[PDB]
């Protein structure tokens, strides 16, 4: 039980060092619906492997059983991918940086059915992060919160709550260090956590879309298992 013993600085340190790499796409400037979704699926499939090993480094996650670890990832995998997306897209207004070599705007998403809606929602989330001037330290906190929170409602469950409260203290510690007043700390904390409601929403909509083009044709064997874990 080392997660509950970490200081706020040691928490941030651990999370920052645990960050997955930014993967490149196979974008090879041709001029379609098939190609675009194929690139994103391939990218997501490779990001998942890093996400799994990243999740291991999130303090407290290892303490959970195998079944619990599986369930938490099965729930939150698309949320985590998406908050990663809007974060690295932060300083590219009107664009979504899926990869350093794959930067898309709202006009591209239109070449796939129902993709525009999810794009605008992602763009809006990124614009919201930009407005808030979100820090990397705050980002890695939210991402880990998503992992532990998104599936905790489906002696053990108290451990997750104990870790969740720890990350909350960490967030507040970060804000207090940034010179924010106690009122500003509460407000910003709220603003950040309220984003996760929208990220959950985008995720659920994403699942629907993926479940749609699935039985319509080609997802990877790992991405299929992640998808059959919902509906």
């Amino acid at each position: 039980s080392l997660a509950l013993s970490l200081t706020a600085d040691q928490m941030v340190s651990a999370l920052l060092d645990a960050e997955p790499p930014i993967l490149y796409s196979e974008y090879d400037p041709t001029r379609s619906e098939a190609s675009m979704m194929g690139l994103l699926t391939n990218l997501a499939d490779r990001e998942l492997v890093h996400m799994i090993n990243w999740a291991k480094r999130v303090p407290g996650f290892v303490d959970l059983t195998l079944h619990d670890q599986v369930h938490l990832l099965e729930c939150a995998w698309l949320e985590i991918l998406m908050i990663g997306l809007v974060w690295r897209s932060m300083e590219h207004p009107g664009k979504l940086l899926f990869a350093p070599n794959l930067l898309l705007d709202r006009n591209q998403g239109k070449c796939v059915e129902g993709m525009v809606e999810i794009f605008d929602m992602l763009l809006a989330t990124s614009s919201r992060f930009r407005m808030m001037n979100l820090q990397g330290e705050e980002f890695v906190c939210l991402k880990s919160i998503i992992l532990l929170n998104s599936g905790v409602y489906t002696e053990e469950k108290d451990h997750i709550h104990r870790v969740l409260d720890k990350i909350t203290d960490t967030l507040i510690h970060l804000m207090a260090k940034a010179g924010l007043t106690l009122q500003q700390q509460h407000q910003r904390l709220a603003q950040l956590l309220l984003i996760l409601s929208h990220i959950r929403h985008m995720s659920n909509k994403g699942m629907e879309h993926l479940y749609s083009m699935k039985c319509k044709n080609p997802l990877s064997d790992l991405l299929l298992e992640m998808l059959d874990a919902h509906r």
Partner: peptide
């Protein structure tokens, strides 16, 4: 399950 495997490797 692929996920259970990668969570151990």
């Amino acid at each position: 399950k692929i996920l259970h495997r990668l969570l151990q490797d």
